[PDB]
Design a protein around this ligand. Structure first.
Ligand code: ATP
Ligand code: ATP
Ligand code: MG
Ligand code: MG
Lengths: 590, 590
């Protein structure tokens, strides 16, 4: 796991260089120039600080001494207290860097948003909304956060120490190039041998931080269930008892940073001790001058200054790794249902749906559909009936291709749906869901979301066919009133008639209906069923309903018990047969 | 808005002191002692730095000089580079502070979680899940974040400058107590006159940052709708075009910090210039010594060191105000439905429900219920029928008291429901919702969530009465299989029979049923309706259904057209009447 950390910094460094736009590629080349200019100021500032002490020792005239004191303040104006802090040069590059990190935080955030929608339907049913919406939120601030640390604070610190090794070597002696090298080599070994000890407590925190909020968020996505039952006291005691177990564990991971931050201050405190005693001995033995000690005592401080100011970051270095490693664990998840390479679009001509011996399983323990086979001629309505949990809506998932089949074949107009592109397969198919969800905006946008290029005259026209047109004009604010989140402000039945309406604006070749009359009364189905009959005149319809009066005038009725068709045919051919359909018909008549 | 900022720091400082636990109240008193001990080290470190220059100038013996050089390194070991950085004392208090901020981040996070559930039902229908779940996430890290800045970085900086005014006054002259005071008074006026100019761009960012993510999150809470229609390309172009308008506006708020961060470096660069030229003149006029210039040149740097290292924080000072001001805007929202002070519990004896002329309106434009009045004797089943949008489920909201009524009265056993506590009102009432949501865990916990103290033998017993008991034993993994989030992994009908089951474990005095048979076929209602009839034997039941065969054996049938009762009575009394119920009955028979 230490050789895999070497590519975690290598793959993070691919988001540093702007690609495709040369107007941003020469901002990076002169933010590297200002970064290299500040490395020369870290040397020239203590040099001009011993020149203004030597002239006070040698008693220079004031006309020649004042022109090198303001020369010192001007170079301290440009430095502003070492790297990592804000001098005049150190925030001039920050003024130019905040156009470059608006190109990385734009491309990353549009990458972990266009990847969540291209994942298949099996992933979105097993996710948790608290975990997924947090990683998509804190994912663009971990790449932007750590590239503002690896490029501005770690590399300029390591570049300032190497220059502090070449300097003190050619210009003092061989000794103080060894003391600053032995103190910094001891610094890097005692920040790795503690981090390999610290990793006991940091990886046992990420697995438990997601499990201490996963109940509180899921007690907040469905607010009403909590409300219906006596509660709001039970859900707060389980969140107190799950935040004791987390704050008892982050105590061991926040007070393990102080043990790292006191074993790094002990190394710096020894190299300063071995360096200050050696300069004091060379002045006593008159190898150097007292002005050369002033150069040493103000250069070792600014070398060891960014090593201590980086010590305040370690608990948000860690959070920017946790919010980054969960992002790349997400992006190495391929789509389960893949279109083939070299796939052409679906050529839709008539709308002839055929299953040939399709078998399907959700999780390999049970076969959900066993040898399902039928043929729907174009312009005909097919009816699916049966008990709950038979596999009725699962057939309307495979025709839309959310899921790959195990064996058999699905054909539309003699063309397999697994061969053609899935983005052209579901352009001719329009399905109303069983329980309908709506976007959290105007209802005139929930209806026009079927075909988005439609005008306001066509939205109102096909909302007449859904039967809601005379119910919205009794509302205040007209068509742009609000539904709240997931349509909960309307109704059970007014929520549903929007979903019929959206499908009509799409006007698909194949129309599918999971449940359309469930929340509607008996007076509103044949206002829609007769209105859909002049919409489904020459277009293929697959309907499934639990009430059995709607499918009397259907073309072919299929009965599904446990994923296996027991009997098929028309309405009058199954009442005279006396099978399970006739017993289901007589049970509803009385 | 500048006099209201003075209480934003006053009310934030109420989360500093731990209340009720004296074991944490004496950690704060000696984290104040270590904070006052570091203020004395900021004076004693440059004093011992001019002692080790004066002994090199006076050529002290090595036996007397080495005992004051290690005295300098030991006090630099304790300081570690000024306040805001990590010395040995400056992270000793950090080791003791991370038990105190686990008492504030515990009490704040359990305050903005026990306030979201006590808000009424009108607020949760108009909220957005992306906004609410973010403020509850980033709300405990803004109080903890800013109390680690106001107490550790702002006040110790202002305490180090005042000590730097008393020092340089009594111990040098009257001059350098004026230069460090005139430079810092000019510092505070030019960080207020820029912040009052900056506030144009920071308050126009919070109103637009919530509106650039409110579409992307709401295109992700309902993943399937996006999937059913041709999409995943339309929802990513509207998020690219809404992140150009945000990154074009945060550019004006991130490059307004650099203009603040270069007008603060210009003030520090002048006070260092006016101070270094005045010490150089006093040594030239022999008022002071060259060793006194070394004291000045290493004390003004560490006074002006935390003013530049605080310059790297200003774009996460701002985010910790935005994530804090949205939290206190949330907490000044009272509950709409309030129980009375001095309210006793509901004394439930028989279960006699009475409405007396109740009127109700959602948003004052329309009267939803107009003069609704009925009386339900105990042990009787009431039936509500009518078209969609009539006000049927709204009656089952007022009986549960999500909403206050405008006029009239609601009585249960001769007791008004507005007078008694609402936590005892909804303990005798058990309602199954219309569209049922489930928690994202085992189904044996979704059924036991009605009465949580029930055992496994009673969960399985009352799941027989819901008719799902023989359907779960065909599943793998038994009763602790997963439903995914909001129950979407089960079914439309297996999702619903869990919600009947939960209500039976509660065994309430009054049973309410919005929709119980909507997703179930005709063979599964009378397996439940006969099973509920030996549950509803002596307990009050209010049922409302669109299918009309279920309410034939009801005790009293109410017909609702537009929130007004048109006719009432039994089943045979409305078929011979020939009203709107008989026309609704003949329309379903054929
Ligand atoms: N996402 C899923 N993961 C695992 N199993 C599933 C999933 N969806 C459905 N099943 C299983 O497949 C069976 C078929 O359920 P389906 O959703 O087809 O109901 P249905 O037959 O259409 O009837 P109804 O519409 O009345 O619920 C169910 O018994 C269920 O246990
Ligand atoms: N939260 C809400 N905010 C504003 N208006 C609402 C809200 N809930 C319902 N309404 C309005 O009140 C009317 C009554 O709707 P209700 O939820 O009572 O449906 P219903 O009469 O029970 O019939 P069904 O159950 O078949 O939908 C609707 O026309 C709707 O416009
Ligand atoms: Mg279904
Ligand atoms: Mg309803």
């Amino acid at each position: 796991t230490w050789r895999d950390f070497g590519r975690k910094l290598r793959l993070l460094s691919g988001y540093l260089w702007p690609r495709g736009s040369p107007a941003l590629q020469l901002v990076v080349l002169i933010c590297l120039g200002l970064m290299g200019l500040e490395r020369a100021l870290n040397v020239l500032v203590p040099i001009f600080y011993r020149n203004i002490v030597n002239l006070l020792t040698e008693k220079a005239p004031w006309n020649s001494l004042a022109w090198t004191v303001t020369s010192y303040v001007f170079l301290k104006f440009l430095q502003g207290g070492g790297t990592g802090s804000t001098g005049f040069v150190s925030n001039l590059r920050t003024f130019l860097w905040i156009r470059v990190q608006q190109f990385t935080s734009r491309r990353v955030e549009l990458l972990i948003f266009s990847h969540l929608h291209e994942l298949s339907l099996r992933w979105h049913l097993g996710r948790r909304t608290g975990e997924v919406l947090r990683i998509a939120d804190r994912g663009t601030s971990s790449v932007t956060g750590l590239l503002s640390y690896l490029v501005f604070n770690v590399i300029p610190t390591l570049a300032d120490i190497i220059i502090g090794i070449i300097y003190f070597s050619m210009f003092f002696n061989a000794w103080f190039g060894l003391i600053v090298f032995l103190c910094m080599s001891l610094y890097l070994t005692l920040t790795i041998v503690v981090t390999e000890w610290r990793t006991k407590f940091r990886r046992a925190m990420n697995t438990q931080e997601n499990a201490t909020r996963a109940r509180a968020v899921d007690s907040l996505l469905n607010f009403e269930t909590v409300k219906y039952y006596n509660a709001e006291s039970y859900e707060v005691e389980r969140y107190r008892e799950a935040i004791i177990k987390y704050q008892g564990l982050e105590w061991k991971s926040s007070a393990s940073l102080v043990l790292l931050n006191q074993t790094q201050n002990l190394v710096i405190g020894l190299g300063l001790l071995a360096g200050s005693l050696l300069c004091a001995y060379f002045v006593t033995e008159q190898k150097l001058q007292v002005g050369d000690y002033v150069l040493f005592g103000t250069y070792i401080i600014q070398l060891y200054m960014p090593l201590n100011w980086f010590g305040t970051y370690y608990r948000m270095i860690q959070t920017n790794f946790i919010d980054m490693e969960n992002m790349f664990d997400l992006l190495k998840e391929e789509t389960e249902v893949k279109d083939l390479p070299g796939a052409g679009p679906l050529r839709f001509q008539k709308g002839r749906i055929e299953f040939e011996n399709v078998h399907f399983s959700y999780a390999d323990g049970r076969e959900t559909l066993q040898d399902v086979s039928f043929t729907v001629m174009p312009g005909q309505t097919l009816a699916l009936v049966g008990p709950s949990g038979a596999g009725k809506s699962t057939i309307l998932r495979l025709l839309f291709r959310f899921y790959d089949i195990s064996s058999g074949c699905i054909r539309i107009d003699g063309q397999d749906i697994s061969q053609v592109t899935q983005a052209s397969l579901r352009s001719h198919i329009g399905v109303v869901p069983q329980d309908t969800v709506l976007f959290n905006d105007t209802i005139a946008d929930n209806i026009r979301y079927g075909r988005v290029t439609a005008g306001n005259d066509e939205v109102e026209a096909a909302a007449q066919a859904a039967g809601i047109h005379d119910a919205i004009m009794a509302f205040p604010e007209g068509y742009r009133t609000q539904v709240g989140e997931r349509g909960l402000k309307l109704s059970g039945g007014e929520k549903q008639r929007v979903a019929i309406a959206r499908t009509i604006l799409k006007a698909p070749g194949i129309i599918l209906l999971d449940q359309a009359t469930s929340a509607l009364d008996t007076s509103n189905e044949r206002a829609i069923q007769a209105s859909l009959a002049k919409v489904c005149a020459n277009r293929t319809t697959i309907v499934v309903a639990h009430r059995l009066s709607t499918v009397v005038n259907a073309d072919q009725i299929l009965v599904i018990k446990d994923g296996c068709i027991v009997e098929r045919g028309r309405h009058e051919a199954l009442l005279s047969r006396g099978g399970v359909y006739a017993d289901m018909w007589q049970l509803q008549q009385g």
